[PDB]
Coordinates of C-alpha atoms in Angstrom, one line a residue:
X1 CA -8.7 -51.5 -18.2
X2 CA -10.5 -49.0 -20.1
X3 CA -13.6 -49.8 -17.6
X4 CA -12.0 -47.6 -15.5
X5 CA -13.3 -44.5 -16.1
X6 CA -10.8 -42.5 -13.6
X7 CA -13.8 -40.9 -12.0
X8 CA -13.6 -39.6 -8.4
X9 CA -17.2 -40.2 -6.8
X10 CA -16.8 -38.4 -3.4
X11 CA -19.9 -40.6 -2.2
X12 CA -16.4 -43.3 -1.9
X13 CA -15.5 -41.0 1.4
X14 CA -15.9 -43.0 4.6
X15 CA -15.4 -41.0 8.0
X16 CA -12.6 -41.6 10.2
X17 CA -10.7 -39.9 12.9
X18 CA -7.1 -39.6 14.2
X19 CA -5.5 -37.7 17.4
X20 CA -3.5 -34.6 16.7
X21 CA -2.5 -31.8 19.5
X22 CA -4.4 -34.1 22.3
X23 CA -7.3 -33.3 19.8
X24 CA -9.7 -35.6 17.6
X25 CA -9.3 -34.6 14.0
X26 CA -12.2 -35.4 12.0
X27 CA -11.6 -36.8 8.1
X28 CA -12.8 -39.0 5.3
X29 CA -11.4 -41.4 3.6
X30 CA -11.0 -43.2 -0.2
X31 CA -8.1 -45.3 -0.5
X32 CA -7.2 -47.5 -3.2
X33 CA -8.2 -45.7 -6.2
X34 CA -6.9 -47.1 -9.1
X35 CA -5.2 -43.6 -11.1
X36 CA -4.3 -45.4 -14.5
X37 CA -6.4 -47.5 -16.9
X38 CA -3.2 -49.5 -18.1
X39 CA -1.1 -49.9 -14.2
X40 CA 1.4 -52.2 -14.2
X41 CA 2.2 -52.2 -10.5
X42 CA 0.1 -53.1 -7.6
X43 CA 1.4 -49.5 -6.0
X44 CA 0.1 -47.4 -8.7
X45 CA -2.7 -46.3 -6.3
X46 CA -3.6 -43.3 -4.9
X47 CA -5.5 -42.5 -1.3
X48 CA -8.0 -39.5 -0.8
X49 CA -8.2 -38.1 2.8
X50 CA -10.5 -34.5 3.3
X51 CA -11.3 -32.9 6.5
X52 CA -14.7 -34.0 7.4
X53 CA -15.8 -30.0 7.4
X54 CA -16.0 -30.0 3.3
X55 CA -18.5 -32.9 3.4
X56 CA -20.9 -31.0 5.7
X57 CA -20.3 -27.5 4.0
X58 CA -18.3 -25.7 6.6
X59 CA -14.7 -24.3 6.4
X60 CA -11.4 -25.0 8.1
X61 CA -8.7 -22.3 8.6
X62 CA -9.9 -20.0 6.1
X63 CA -10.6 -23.1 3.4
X64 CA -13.9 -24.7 2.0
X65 CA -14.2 -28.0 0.0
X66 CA -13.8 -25.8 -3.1
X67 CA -11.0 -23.8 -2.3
X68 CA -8.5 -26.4 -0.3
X69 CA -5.2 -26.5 -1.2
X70 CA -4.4 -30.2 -2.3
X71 CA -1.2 -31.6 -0.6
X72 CA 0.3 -34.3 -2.5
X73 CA 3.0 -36.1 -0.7
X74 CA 5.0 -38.9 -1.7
X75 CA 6.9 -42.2 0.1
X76 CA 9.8 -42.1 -2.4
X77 CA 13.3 -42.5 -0.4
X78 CA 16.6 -43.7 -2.3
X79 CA 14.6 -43.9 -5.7
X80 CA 12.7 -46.6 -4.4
X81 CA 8.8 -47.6 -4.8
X82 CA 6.7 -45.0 -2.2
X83 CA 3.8 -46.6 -1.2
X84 CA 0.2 -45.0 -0.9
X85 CA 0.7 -43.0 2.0
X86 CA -2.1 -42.8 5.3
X87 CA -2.3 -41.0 8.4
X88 CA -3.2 -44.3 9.9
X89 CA -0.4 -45.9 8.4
X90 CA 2.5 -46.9 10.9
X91 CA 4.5 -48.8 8.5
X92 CA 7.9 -47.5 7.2
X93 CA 7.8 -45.2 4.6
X94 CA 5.1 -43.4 5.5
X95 CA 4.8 -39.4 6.7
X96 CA 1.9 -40.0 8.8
X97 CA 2.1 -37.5 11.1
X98 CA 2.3 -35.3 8.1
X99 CA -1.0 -35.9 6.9
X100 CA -2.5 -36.3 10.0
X101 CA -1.1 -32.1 10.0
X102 CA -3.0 -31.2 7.0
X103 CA -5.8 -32.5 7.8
X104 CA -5.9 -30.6 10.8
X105 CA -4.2 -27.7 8.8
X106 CA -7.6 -27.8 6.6
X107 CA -5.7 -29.7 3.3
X108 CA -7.3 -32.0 0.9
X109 CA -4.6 -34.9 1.0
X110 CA -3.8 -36.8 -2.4
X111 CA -1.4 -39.3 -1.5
X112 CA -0.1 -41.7 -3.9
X113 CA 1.7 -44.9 -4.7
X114 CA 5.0 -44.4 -6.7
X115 CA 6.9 -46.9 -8.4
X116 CA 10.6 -47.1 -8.0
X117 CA 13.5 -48.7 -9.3
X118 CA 13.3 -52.5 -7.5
X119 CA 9.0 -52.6 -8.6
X120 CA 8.4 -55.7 -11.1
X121 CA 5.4 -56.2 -13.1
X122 CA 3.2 -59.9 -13.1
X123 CA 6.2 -61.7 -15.3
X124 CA 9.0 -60.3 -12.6
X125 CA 10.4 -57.9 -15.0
X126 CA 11.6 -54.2 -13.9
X127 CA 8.9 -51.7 -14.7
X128 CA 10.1 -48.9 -12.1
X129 CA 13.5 -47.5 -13.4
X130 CA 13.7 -43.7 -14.5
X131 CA 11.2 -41.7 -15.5
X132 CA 8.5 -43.9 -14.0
X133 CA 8.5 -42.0 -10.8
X134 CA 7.7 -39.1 -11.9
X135 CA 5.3 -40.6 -14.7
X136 CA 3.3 -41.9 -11.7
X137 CA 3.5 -38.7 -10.3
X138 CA 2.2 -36.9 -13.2
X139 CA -0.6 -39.5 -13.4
X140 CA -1.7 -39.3 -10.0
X141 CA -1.9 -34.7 -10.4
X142 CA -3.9 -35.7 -14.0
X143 CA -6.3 -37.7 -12.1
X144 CA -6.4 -35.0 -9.7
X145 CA -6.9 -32.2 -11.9
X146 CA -9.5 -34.4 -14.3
X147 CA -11.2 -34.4 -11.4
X148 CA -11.8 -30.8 -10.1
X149 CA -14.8 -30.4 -8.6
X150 CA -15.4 -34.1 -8.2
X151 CA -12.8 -34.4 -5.8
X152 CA -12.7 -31.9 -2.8
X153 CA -9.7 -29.2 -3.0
X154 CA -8.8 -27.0 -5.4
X155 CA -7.2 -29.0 -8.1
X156 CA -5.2 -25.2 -8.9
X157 CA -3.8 -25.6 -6.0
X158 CA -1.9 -28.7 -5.6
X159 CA 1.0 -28.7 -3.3
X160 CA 3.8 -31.6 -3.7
X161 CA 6.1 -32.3 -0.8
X162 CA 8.8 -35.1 -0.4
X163 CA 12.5 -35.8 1.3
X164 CA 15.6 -36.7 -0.6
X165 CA 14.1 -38.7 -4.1
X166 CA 11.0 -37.6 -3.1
X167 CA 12.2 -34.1 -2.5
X168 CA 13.4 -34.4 -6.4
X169 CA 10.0 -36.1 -7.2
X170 CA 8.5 -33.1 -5.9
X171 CA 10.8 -30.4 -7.7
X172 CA 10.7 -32.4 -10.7
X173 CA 7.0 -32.1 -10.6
X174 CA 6.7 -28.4 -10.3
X175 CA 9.4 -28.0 -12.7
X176 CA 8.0 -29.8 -15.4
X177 CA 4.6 -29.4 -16.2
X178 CA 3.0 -30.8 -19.5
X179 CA 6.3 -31.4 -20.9
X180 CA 5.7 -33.7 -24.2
X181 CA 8.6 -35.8 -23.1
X182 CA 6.9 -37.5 -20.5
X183 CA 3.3 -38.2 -23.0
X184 CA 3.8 -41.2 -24.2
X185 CA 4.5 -43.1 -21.3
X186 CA 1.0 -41.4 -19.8
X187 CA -0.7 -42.6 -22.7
X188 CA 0.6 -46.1 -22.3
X189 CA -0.8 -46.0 -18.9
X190 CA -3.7 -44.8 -19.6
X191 CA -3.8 -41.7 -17.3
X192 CA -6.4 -39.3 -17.6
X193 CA -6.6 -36.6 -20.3
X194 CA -5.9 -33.5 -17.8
X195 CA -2.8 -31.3 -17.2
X196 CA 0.1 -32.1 -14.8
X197 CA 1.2 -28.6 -13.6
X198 CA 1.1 -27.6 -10.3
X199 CA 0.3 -24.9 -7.9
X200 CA 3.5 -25.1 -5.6
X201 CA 6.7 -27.2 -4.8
X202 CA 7.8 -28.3 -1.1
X203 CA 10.8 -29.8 -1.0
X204 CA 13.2 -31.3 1.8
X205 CA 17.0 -32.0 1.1
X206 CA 15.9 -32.7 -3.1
X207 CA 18.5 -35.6 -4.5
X208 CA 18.5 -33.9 -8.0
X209 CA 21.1 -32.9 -10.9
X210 CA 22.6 -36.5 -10.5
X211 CA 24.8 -35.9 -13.3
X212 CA 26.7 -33.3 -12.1
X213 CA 26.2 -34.6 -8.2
X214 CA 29.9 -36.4 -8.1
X215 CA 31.1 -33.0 -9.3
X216 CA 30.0 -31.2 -6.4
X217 CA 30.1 -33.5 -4.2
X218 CA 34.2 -33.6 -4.8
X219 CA 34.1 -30.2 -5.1
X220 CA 32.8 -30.2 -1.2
X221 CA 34.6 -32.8 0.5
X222 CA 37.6 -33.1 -1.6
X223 CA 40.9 -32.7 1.3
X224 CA 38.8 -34.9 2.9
X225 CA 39.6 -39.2 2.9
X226 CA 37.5 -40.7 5.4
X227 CA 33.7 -41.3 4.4
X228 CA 31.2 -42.7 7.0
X229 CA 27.7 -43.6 6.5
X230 CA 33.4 -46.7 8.1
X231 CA 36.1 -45.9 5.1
X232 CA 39.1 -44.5 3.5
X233 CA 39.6 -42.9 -0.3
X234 CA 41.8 -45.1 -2.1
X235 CA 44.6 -43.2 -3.8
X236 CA 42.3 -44.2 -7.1
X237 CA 39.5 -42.3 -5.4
X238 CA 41.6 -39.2 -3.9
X239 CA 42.6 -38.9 -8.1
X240 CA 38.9 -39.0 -9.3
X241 CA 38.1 -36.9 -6.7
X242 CA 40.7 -33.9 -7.5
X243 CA 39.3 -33.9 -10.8
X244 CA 35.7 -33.9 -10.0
X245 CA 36.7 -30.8 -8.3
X246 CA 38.1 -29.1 -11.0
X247 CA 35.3 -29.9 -13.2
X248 CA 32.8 -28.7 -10.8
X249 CA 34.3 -25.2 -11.7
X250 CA 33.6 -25.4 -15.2
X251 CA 30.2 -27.2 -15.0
X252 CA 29.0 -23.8 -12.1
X253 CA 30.6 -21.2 -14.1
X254 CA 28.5 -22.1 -17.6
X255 CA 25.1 -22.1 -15.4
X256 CA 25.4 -18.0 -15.4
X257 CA 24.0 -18.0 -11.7
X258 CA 23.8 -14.5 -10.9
X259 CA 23.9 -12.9 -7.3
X260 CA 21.0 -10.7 -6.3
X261 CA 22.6 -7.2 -7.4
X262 CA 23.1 -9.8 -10.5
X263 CA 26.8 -10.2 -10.5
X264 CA 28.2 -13.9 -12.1
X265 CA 28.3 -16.4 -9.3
X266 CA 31.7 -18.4 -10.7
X267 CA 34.7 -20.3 -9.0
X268 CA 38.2 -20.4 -9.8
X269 CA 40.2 -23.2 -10.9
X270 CA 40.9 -24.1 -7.2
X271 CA 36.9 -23.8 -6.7
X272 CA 37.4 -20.6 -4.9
X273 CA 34.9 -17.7 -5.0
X274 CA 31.8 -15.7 -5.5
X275 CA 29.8 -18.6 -5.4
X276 CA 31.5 -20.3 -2.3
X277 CA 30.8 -17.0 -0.3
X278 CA 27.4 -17.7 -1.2
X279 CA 27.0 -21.3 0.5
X280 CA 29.4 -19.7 3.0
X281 CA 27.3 -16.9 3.9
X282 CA 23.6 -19.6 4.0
X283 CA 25.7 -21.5 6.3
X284 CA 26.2 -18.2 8.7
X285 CA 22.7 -17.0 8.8
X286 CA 21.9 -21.2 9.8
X287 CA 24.4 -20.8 12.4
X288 CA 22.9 -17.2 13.5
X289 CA 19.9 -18.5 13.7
X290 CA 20.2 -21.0 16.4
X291 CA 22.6 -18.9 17.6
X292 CA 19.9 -16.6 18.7
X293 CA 17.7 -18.8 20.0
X294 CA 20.7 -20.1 22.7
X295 CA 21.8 -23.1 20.4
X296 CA 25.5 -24.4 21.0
X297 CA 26.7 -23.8 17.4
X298 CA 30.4 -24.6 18.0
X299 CA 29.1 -28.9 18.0
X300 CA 30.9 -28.1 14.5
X301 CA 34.0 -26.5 13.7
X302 CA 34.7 -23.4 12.5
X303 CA 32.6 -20.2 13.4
X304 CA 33.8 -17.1 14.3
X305 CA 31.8 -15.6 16.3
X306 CA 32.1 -11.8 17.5
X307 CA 29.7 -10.5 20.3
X308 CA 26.3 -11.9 19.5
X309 CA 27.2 -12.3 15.9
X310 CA 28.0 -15.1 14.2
X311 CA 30.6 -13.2 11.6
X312 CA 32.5 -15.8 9.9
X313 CA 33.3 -19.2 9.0
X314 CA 36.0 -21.2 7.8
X315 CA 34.1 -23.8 5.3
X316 CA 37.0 -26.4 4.8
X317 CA 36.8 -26.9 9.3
X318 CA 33.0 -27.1 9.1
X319 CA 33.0 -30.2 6.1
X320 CA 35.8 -31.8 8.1
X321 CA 33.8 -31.5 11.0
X322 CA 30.9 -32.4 9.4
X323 CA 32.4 -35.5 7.5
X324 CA 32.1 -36.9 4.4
X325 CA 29.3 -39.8 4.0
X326 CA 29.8 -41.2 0.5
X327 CA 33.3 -42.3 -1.6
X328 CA 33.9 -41.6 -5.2
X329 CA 32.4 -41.0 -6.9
X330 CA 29.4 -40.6 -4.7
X331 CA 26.7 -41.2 -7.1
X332 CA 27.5 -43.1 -10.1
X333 CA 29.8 -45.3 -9.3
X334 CA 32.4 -47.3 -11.7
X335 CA 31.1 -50.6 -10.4
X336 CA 27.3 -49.8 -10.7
X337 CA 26.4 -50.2 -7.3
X338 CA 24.4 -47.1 -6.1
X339 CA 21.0 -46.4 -5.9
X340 CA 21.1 -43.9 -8.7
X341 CA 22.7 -46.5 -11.2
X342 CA 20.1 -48.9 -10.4
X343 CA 17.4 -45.7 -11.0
X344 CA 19.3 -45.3 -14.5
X345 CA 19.0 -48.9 -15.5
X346 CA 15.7 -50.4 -17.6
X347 CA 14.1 -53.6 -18.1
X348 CA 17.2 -55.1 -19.8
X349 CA 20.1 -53.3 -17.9
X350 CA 19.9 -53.5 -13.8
X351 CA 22.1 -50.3 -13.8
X352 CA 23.4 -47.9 -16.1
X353 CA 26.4 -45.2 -15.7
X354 CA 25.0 -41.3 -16.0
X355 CA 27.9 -39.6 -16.7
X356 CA 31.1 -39.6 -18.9
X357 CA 33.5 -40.2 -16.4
X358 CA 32.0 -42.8 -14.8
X359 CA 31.7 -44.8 -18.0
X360 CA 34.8 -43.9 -19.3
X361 CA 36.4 -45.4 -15.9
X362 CA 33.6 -48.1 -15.4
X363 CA 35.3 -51.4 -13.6
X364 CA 32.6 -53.5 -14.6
X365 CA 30.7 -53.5 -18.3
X366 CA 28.2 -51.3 -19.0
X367 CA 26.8 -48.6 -21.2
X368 CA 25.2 -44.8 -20.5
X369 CA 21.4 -43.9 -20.3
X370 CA 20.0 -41.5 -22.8
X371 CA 20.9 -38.3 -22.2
X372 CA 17.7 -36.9 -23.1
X373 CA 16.5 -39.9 -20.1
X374 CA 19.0 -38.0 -17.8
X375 CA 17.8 -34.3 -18.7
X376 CA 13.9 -35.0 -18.5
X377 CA 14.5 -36.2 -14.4
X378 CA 16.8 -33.0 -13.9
X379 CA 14.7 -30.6 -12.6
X380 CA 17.3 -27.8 -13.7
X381 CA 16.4 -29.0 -17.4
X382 CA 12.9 -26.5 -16.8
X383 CA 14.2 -23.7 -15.7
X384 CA 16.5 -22.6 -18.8
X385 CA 14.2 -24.4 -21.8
X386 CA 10.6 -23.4 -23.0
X387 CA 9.5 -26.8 -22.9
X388 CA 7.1 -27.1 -19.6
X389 CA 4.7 -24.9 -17.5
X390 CA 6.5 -24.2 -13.9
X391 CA 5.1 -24.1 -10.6
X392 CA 5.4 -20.1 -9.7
X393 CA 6.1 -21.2 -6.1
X394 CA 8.8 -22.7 -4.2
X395 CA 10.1 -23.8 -0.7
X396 CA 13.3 -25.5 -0.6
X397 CA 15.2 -27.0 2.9
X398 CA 18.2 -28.5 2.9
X399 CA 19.6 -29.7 6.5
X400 CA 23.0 -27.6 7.6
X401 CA 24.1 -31.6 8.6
X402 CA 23.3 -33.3 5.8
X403 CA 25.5 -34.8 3.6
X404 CA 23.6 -37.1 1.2
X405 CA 24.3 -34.5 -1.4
X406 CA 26.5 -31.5 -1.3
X407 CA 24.9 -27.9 -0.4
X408 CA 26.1 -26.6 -3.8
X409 CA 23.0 -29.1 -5.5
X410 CA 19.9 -27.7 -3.4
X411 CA 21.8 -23.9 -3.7
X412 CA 21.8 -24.1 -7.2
X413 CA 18.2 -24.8 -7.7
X414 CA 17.1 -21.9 -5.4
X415 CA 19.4 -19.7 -7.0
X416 CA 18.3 -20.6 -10.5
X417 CA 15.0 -20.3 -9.5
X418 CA 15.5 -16.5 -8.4
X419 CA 17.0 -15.8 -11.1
X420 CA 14.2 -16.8 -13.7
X421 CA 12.0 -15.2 -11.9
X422 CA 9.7 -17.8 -9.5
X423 CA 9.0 -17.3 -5.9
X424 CA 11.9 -19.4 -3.9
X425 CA 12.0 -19.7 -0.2
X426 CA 15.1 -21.5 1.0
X427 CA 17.4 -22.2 3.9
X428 CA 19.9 -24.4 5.2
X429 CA 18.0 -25.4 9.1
X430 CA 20.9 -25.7 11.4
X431 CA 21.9 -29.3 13.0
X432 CA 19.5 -31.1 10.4
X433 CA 20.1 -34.6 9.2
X434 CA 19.2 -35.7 6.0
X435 CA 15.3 -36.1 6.9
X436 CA 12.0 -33.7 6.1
X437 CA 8.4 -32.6 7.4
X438 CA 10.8 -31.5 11.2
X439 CA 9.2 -27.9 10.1
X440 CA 5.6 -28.3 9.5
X441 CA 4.8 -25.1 10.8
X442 CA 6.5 -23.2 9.0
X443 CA 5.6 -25.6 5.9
X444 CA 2.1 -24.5 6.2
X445 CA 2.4 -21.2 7.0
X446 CA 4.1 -20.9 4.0
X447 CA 1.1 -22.8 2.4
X448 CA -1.0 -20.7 4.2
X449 CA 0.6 -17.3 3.1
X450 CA 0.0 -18.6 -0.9
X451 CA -3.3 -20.3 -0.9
X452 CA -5.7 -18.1 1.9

C-alpha cells in the first residue's frame, strides 16, 4: 500500500557469512523488501546482500560502500517467475554461487524476485505474461536508484546479469532505459519515482528477438530433420522450415549490419555470405582457443586445422554435428505450445502467436499479441529508435554448444551494438551448453576493468 514508503534503511542489514575459496566471506543481509507499493505477486521482492567491509568503513578490491558496483542478477529461466535470489539459497533456480562471488568480488548484490508467465495473483488469474518481467525489473533498478546513498553501492553503477530469459531480462534492461512504454504499468505498481537505466549489461546465451527467432533458427539447422532435446521434421515442418530460411535473408539484410571496415553484412537467397563468414569466423577463434590450451576440438565435426592453426570450418558438418534441439517452428509454434507463446499470452488468452506465419498457419485458434507488446521486449527495438537511455557497456556469451537459439540471434545484438557505437565484448566459449555464470572470472574482471 501506499504505507510503503520504498525506503531502504541499511540499519535492516544483519551479518552473515558463507564459505568461498576455503575462505569465510563476511556479508549482510536484508531480504524481503517489498519494491512496489501496489505488488501483485508474493515474488515481487527483492533481497540486499553487501560485503560486511562497507558497514565498518573499509574497502574491498579497490571498492567502498559508496562506490560498489551493484550486481543485479535475476532467476528468470524459460520466461518463468525468478525467485529472490540468496547465496544461502540451495533451491533451484538460484545462482548462488554467483553471489556468494560478488560478495567476495567486493559487489553490492540486489537480487530480485521476477514474475513470469505461470505467476497468478490472490483470485488465480495470470498477472506474469509479457512485459511484466521486465516491469519488475525496472521496479526493482527504481527502488535501487531512489535509493542511492541509502542503500550501499553505487546506484550508477548497476550491473544486470542473467542466462537464457534472464540473459534477455538483462539485455532488455540495459537496452531500454526510461522508455515511456513501460510507465504505466510502473505506476500501476507503484514503483518508486527514480530512473531505470543502467550502468552495464551481462548477459549469458540472451533468448531475445523472438519474432524473428524461427527465422534464424531455420536458417541454421535447415538440411537438418532430426531435433533432440527424440524427433523427426514432418514433411509439413521440412516446408515451413525452407521458408523460414529464405525469409531469414530478407529479415538480416534490412538490419544494415555493417562489418568492422563497415562493409553490409547480407546473405543471399540461399542464406550464403558476408554475414555467415562472420558466425563462421566466431566459431574459428572458439575453436582456436581451446585449441591452444590442448582442448580436443574435433568432439564436433568439421575444422580444418593446419599446423597449430585452426584455419577453417565447414558450418553445415559442425550444426549436423552439433544437432538440432527444437522442431518448427522452434519458437512460436502453430499449436501454441512453447514457452514463448505462453510469455505472449495475458489474463484472458493462455498463449498468443508472435508472428505472421505462425498465425497465418496456426492449427489451433488464436490471435497475435500487439506488435508494439512484441517490440517493447526486443531488445533490438533500442538500438535503432531514440526512445530509451542505453547501458554504454556490454558483455555478451553465447556457448559454441548451445542450441536453444541459433548463433545468428546473440551475433546480431553484438554486432548491432558495435555498430551504434556502445562498448560490446562478446564470444562464442567453446563446448558450452546452454547455461551462464561458468566464467565468473572473467565476468568480473570485466566488471572490474569498468567500475575500478
Amino acid at each position: 500500500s501506499m504505507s510503503n514508503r520504498l525506503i531502504f534503511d541499511a540499519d535492516w542489514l544483519v551479518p552473515e557469512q558463507v564459505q568461498v575459496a576455503g575462505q569465510a566471506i563476511q556479508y549482510y543481509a536484508a531480504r524481503n523488501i517489498q519494491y512496489v507499493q501496489h505488488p501483485v505477486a508474493a515474488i515481487q521482492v527483492l533481497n540486499v546482500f553487501v560485503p560486511a567491509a562497507y558497514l565498518h568503513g573499509s574497502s574491498v578490491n579497490g571498492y567502498q560502500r559508496a562506490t560498489a558496483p551493484i550486481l543485479m542478477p535475476n532467476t528468470v529461466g524459460g520466461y518463468l517467475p525468478g525467485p529472490a535470489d540468496d547465496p544461502q539459497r540451495v533451491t533451484w533456480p538460484t545462482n548462488a554461487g554467483t553471489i556468494q562471488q560478488a560478495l567476495k568480488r567486493g559487489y553490492v548484490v540486489v537480487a530480485a524476485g521476477i514474475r513470469g508467465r505461470t505467476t497468478v495473483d490472490k483470485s488465480g488469474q495470470r498477472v506474469g505474461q509479457a512485459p511484466a518481467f521486465i516491469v519488475d525489473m525496472k521496479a526493482a533498478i527504481r527502488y535501487v536508484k531512489y535509493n542511492q546513498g541509502r542503500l550501499p553501492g553505487d546506484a550508477n553503477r548497476i550491473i544486470t546479469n542473467g542466462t537464457s530469459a534472464g540473459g534477455a531480462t538483462s539485455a532488455l534492461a540495459g537496452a531500454s532505459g526510461n522508455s515511456a512504454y513501460f510507465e504505466p504499468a510502473l505506476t500501476a505498481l507503484g514503483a518508486a519515482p527514480a530512473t531505470d537505466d543502467i550502468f552495464a549489461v551481462s548477459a549469458y546465451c540472451p533468448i531475445h528477438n523472438l519474432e524473428h527467432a524461427d527465422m534464424a533458427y531455420e536458417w541454421q539447422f535447415n538440411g537438418i530433420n532430426d531435433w533432440h532435446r527424440s524427433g523427426q521434421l514432418t514433411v509439413e515442418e521440412q516446408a515451413l522450415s525452407l521458408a523460414l530460411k529464405a525469409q531469414f535473408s530478407t529479415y538480416l539484410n534490412q538490419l544494415k549490419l555493417t562489418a568492422s571496415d563497415g562493409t553490409h553484412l547480407t546473405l543471399n537467397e540461399a542464406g550464403m555470405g558476408s554475414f555467415r563468414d562472420v558466425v563462421r569466423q566466431l566459431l574459428i577463434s572458439s575453436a582456436q582457443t581451446a585449441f591452444d590450451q590442448g582442448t580436443d576440438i574435433h568432439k564436433y565435426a568439421g575444422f580444418v586445422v593446419t599446423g597449430n592453426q585452426v584455419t577453417d570450418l565447414d558450418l553445415s558438418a559442425y550444426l549436423k554435428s552439433l544437432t538440432r534441439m527444437k522442431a518448427v517452428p522452434a519458437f512460436d509454434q502453430l499449436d501454441l505450445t512453447s514457452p514463448e507463446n505462453n510469455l505472449f499470452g495475458d489474463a484472458t488468452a493462455k498463449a498468443k502467436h508472435f508472428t505472421a506465419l505462425a498465425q497465418t498457419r496456426s492449427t489451433v485458434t488464436a490471435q497475435l499479441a500487439d506488435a508494439e507488446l512484441i517490440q517493447a521486449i526486443n531488445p533490438l527495438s533500442y538500438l535503432t529508435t531514440t526512445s530509451s537511455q542505453v547501458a554504454k557497456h556490454w558483455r555478451i556469451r553465447h556457448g559454441a554448444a548451445d542450441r536453444d537459439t541459433s548463433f545468428a540471434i546473440p551475433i546480431i545484438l553484438a554486432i548491432m551494438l558495435e555498430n551504434h557505437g556502445y562498448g560490446i565484448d562478446f564470444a562464442l566459449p567453446w563446448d558450452i551448453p546452454h547455461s551462464g555464470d561458468y566464467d565468473l572470472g572473467d565476468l568480473f574482471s570485466w566488471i572490474d576493468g569498468l567500475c575500478q
